[PDB]
């Protein structure tokens with residue numbers, strides 16, 4: 001569940017935080033609207049784990065595996081079992097056109113998988129629709145990702161919050177003018193060159209189920225009006241996700257540790273961990 | 281109001297956050313449970329003002345002005361009008377035994393003052409009174425409650441950057457100290473007991489707050505703990521501050537305020553880590569205190 005009030009923790013012993021030592025001297029760890037930007041070295045996972053365990057937190061994870069993409073499911077699920085929200089309740093939602101092609105994978109206690117029988121406009125619509133049909137009653141937080149990926153390292157409760165976006169690996173060090181936002185004023189996704197905090201990737205976002213429903217519905221509705229006007233945003237649902245998060249500031253921002261492609265972009269020093277990466 | 285939804289912001293033009301530039305290189309700006317530690321340089325007040333203003337945020341501010349402490353009210357209130365939550369709705373709650381001594385002060389639009397006329401010691405009384413008035417009035421009247429000492433003046437901005445479900449403030453004597461040096465209550469017989477191997481920060485009892493419901497929970501819990509100590513003839517070394525520290529140890533604050541928010545320059549000077557001295561102690565015989 002998601003309790004209204006602060007959790008009362010048991011006695012815990014861990015290293016004291018040091019006020020006169022920054023946790024990172026190389027990166028920004030809080031946004032100008034006071035949301036944490038999640039990097040290795042910013043959190044004590046034992047404290048967070050206990051906070052979330054006490055609320056009996058359930059996390060849903062959606063992926064779309066259509067056509068040849070069903071081929072990525074086995075690696076995705078096996079690595080999720082090793083690295084995603086381990087120790088917590090997880091409900092995987094696999095959207096697919098080939099239920100019989102979904103691999104048999106052994107799941108840990110408190111973890112389960114549902115197959116949902118079935119383009120970017122549609123993904124937003126479908127997520128929103130299934131939030132209303134079932135995710136709202138079944139999980140507390142919903143995380144939405146691409147299937148052609150593998151977990152290489154811990155991705156846990158540190159990301160959970162009402163609404164989060166993830167820094168796109170191509171733009172985390174770029175000025176706003178370089179971000180590939182939709183730039184036509186006719187588009188619902190329009191952002192001019194003097195606006196923008198970050199460029200978020202469409203491949204990893206989430207939050208409470210209700211905030212995710214709201215984001216995905218808003219993006220779908222915006223795509224529909226754009227379509228009526230003969231417009232398709234330059235990067236489709238990702239352009240709309242960016243517009244949504246510009247106006248509705250996320251309560252956490254995930255660093256590119258959470259979405260990387262080592263083949264394309266190597267391994268810059270600011271990344272102490274590569275947690276979730278593209279599969280060749 | 282406080283909404284159960286992300287607030288939608290209008291077009292605003294402000295400097296882009298820079299992912300590869302730390303906002304501070306000299307201090308910790310986020311706790312290990314991912315709560316911001318608020319220092320000048322960490323926030324853009326334009327964005328925060330807009331977020332809170334669009335929800336018509338109302339902030340209650342409590343002070344206890346008993347006996348001779350009523351003399352501090354004019355300076356406190358006049359400086360709060362200049363620097364506390366300017367641009368937002370504010371409800372001052374003055375707990376006093378001398379309603380007639382409360383000064384006449386000019387208040388801005390959307391700012392109101394209420395005078396609350398006041399078997400246990402005083403610190404217990406303060407926790408009990410705040411908790412009781414949360415139930416009686418604050419829950420219906422304001423969104424956030426901020427509880428401070430009256431012998432204080434606002435010298436610089438104190439605004440919506442502090443607002444969050446629960447916050448405490450770093451005590452100026454201890455922000456650079458190891459936990460073993462913290463003056464927590466160390467007697468295991470006390471409900472405020474914290475052993476040498478526990479503790480994140482030493483919070484000061486003179487500035488805490490949060491949503492009304494979280495402040496009600498905190499003050500009730502502290503009062504109940506003090507009553508248990510009382511039964512056992514125990515008085516925690518630093519009274520309500522000791523209990524505040526125990527509570528915030530077990531219930532992590534969702535923001536922590538740096539010592540910019542509670543300082544005494546006569547005692548501690550002005551260390552380089554402080555860009556602003558926002559809210560400062562007022563000497564007993566200050567010219568504005570009468």
Ligand SMILES: c1ccc(-c2nsc(N3CCNCC3)n2)cc1
Pocket residue numbers: 146147148149169170203259260261264265277278
């Ligand atoms: C430049 C452009 C894209 C990327 C990039 N990294 S991961 C990723 N995706 C999208 C496809 N599904 C799996 C997740 N894309 C990196 C650099």
Ligand SMILES: c1ccc(-c2nsc(N3CCNCC3)n2)cc1
Pocket residue numbers: 429430431432452453486542543544547548560561562
């Ligand atoms: C050592 C001890 C106390 C302080 C200290 N700064 S402000 C403050 N107060 C308590 C009295 N009411 C006004 C707020 N006290 C600083 C260093």
Ligand SMILES: [Cl-]
Pocket residue numbers: 290291
């Ligand atoms: Cl606008």
Ligand SMILES: [Cl-]
Pocket residue numbers: 460461462463464466
């Ligand atoms: Cl001690």
